[PDB]
Design a binder for these strands. Structure first.
Ligand SMILES: Nc1nc2c(ncn2[C@@H]2O[C@H](COP(=O)(O)OP(=O)(O)NP(=O)(O)O)[C@@H](O)[C@H]2O)c(=O)[nH]1
Ligand code: MET
Lengths: 415, 89
RNA sequence: CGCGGGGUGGAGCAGCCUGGUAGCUCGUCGGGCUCAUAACCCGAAGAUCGUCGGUUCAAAUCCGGCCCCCGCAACCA
């Protein structure tokens, strides 16, 4: 007899390179046939974090290795006595593409220890695949459990095939053992193999909330320009999506950074500070700021300043060392074994005197001057004003060839 | 029934100014519409720049300019009070 | 009255408040180095701002009607 109920926290999502079998995974076990069927929802835009409560259950008679499921009991091993439940959990997810990759991080909000679905049909290098590894890999989810999806029928060598290169990839580096699971989400054939591979979870213990994080803002439209009438001004609320932990209703006390406002030779970008009136959750709003797609946080704006994508790369940090031009930059780097540009595999030059590289902190990419060669550390000056919070950080670093750009590796600044 | 040129450049200094406009909406702006009779609406709309073409629409043609001018004068008076510079070039 | 970047020499552009000089980072023939040059020495080159009417002392810059692209844009084989 089992009916205890204990510790149903820590939800888990699935992301990857575009159409890697994510949506079908978050919907993988839901309904039967009548109504409540297929996948996703009526709106394909990023939205609706949780799938809420997910049935995860098993039987007694039928054996453990090959058996776990949502739909009541099992008609495969027969029906005699009531089945046993596992736990109460949601299923989250986030989109990504050339444009939408960022959502990954924020989509990891309700997603702790996401389950990872790699490809089978598509080959390993893809822009947002390695982008997925070198970006997401630092987010703190080692609970990623690799699941090869997207394979229907071929000469059956395909399975172990998708196992090979992955066997070469991880485990010889950061991110210790990650389970790799063969499945077809396509045809609903072979799902039990995805649960029998996924049941494991990562080691590190963590807490609930009350810390010092920073959310980043996201997409929203710039509401009707004054052309009708000066009316239709609620301020033009615009809003973002959270990544790390939180507290309460309070969101924006400070808009960091802010407008150039010109001023002679050296121009500083000056921030604007306000308390929160709005915070849109959806068709109707919320008290706190919910991640996903279009959200609208109270910002009082005549339809000018909002800069509908005139100034891209929405940037948000907290506090500052307080001076509109503050430049001292000491970075201990790492980079990579070899350099990674466009498709090319040939090496690119090491450290030379006064070379220029992209020092990009957050959603800004700022001109930076690698200058002093410290050996494996460097000093890199910036132009446009920006504020880092702590030594912990990941600097995105690129290379200059004829108006073009190539990302060459990583480093971290130490304050 | 004549549309007008009506394009000026306004500026307001304070950060609360964004809301202060609604404060003095609750206080200042009233009755200017009914200063005359038989109009449609009142509007302030950008030239795609910090310049705004405004609008006052009615059947009586000439008064347009008159009224138009008055609306400008508002910010002017507001300027003589609230530090609001309606000045274009 | 919910559509968003745009197109100011063949890659990115704060051009449309400052009504009529025009490139930061591209590609090329002619000289190139009594040491190899993707680091550059000589920016030679050629001006329809994509249709348009109007306004016009002229149009790179406007209201509208025509638009071919990317659209929900950062750790981009
Ligand atoms: N290239 C490719 N697409 C496939 C394959 N099997 C299914 N699809 C497509 O996957 C689509 C569903 O995409 P979607 O589920 O939104 O993507 P996803 O797989 O969840 N990942 P994400 O949404 O995050 O990109 C369907 O239109 C279906 O045709 C396959 O083997 N190869
Ligand atoms: C593509 O060029 C690729 N080598 C970049 C990441 S390594 C999989």
């Amino acid at each position: 007899m089992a009916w205890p109920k204990v510790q149903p926290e820590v939800n888990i999502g699935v992301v990857g390179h575009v159409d890697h079998g994510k949506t079908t995974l978050v919907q993988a076990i839901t309904g039967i046939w009548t109504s409540k069927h297929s996948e996703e929802l009526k709106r394909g835009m990023t939205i609706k974090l949780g799938y809420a409560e997910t049935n995860i259950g098993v039987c007694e008679s039928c054996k453990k290795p090959e058996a776990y499921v949502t739909e009541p009991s099992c008609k495969s091993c027969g029906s005699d006595d009531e089945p046993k439940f596992l736990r109460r959990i949601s299923f989250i997810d986030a989109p990504g593409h050339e444009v939408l990759m960022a959502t990954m991080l924020s989509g990891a909000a309700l997603m702790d220890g996401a389950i990872l679905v790699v490809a089978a049909n598509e080959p390993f290098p893809q822009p947002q695949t390695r982008e997925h590894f070198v970006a997401l890999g630092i987010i703190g989810v080692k609970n990623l459990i690799i699941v090869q999806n997207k394979v229907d029928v071929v000469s059956k060598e395909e399975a172990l095939s998708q196992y090979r290169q992955i066997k070469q990839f991880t485990k010889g580096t950061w991110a210790e053992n990650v389970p790799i699971i063969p499945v077809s989400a396509l045809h609903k054939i072979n799902i039990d193999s995805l649960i029998e591979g996924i049941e494991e979870y990562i080691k590190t213990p963590y807490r609930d909330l009350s810390q010092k994080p920073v959310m980043l803002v996201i997409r929203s439209f710039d509401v009707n320009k004054p052309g009708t009438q000066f009316n239709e001004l609620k301020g033009g609320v615009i809003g973002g999506s959270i990544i790390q932990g939180l507290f309460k209703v309070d969101q924006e006390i400070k808009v960091l950074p802010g407008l150039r406002v010109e001023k002679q030779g050296k121009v500083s970008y000056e921030p604007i500070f306000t308390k929160i009136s709005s915070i849109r959750f959806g068709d109707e709003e919320f008290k706190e700021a919910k991640p996903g797609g279009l959200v609208a946080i109270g910002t009082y704006l005549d339809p000018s300043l909002t800069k509908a994508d005139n100034l891209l790369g929405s940037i948000i940090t907290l506090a500052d060392a307080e001076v509109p031009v503050l430049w001292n930059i000491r970075i201990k780097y790492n980079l990579l074994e070899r350099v990674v540009g466009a498709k090319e595999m040939l090496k690119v030059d090491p450290i030379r005197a006064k070379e220029t590289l992209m020092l990009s902190v957050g959603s800004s990419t700022t001109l930076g001057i690698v200058t002093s060669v410290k050996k494996d550390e460097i000093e890199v000056e910036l132009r446009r004003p920006v504020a880092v919070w702590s030594n912990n950080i990941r600097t995105v670093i690129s290379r200059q060839i004829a108006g073009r750009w190539r990302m060459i590796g990583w480093g971290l600044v130490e304050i | 029934k004549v549309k007008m040129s009506g394009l000026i450049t306004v500026r307001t200094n304070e950060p609360l100014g964004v809301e202060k406009i609604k404060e003095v909406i609750s206080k200042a702006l009233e009755n200017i519409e009914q200063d005359y009779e038989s109009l449609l609406n009142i509007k302030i709309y950008t030239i795609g720049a910090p310049r705004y073409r405004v609008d006052v629409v009615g059947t009586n043609p000439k008064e347009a300019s008159e009224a138009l001018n008055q609306i400008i004068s508002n910010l002017i008076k507001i300027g003589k009070e609230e530090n609001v510079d309606i000045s274009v070039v």
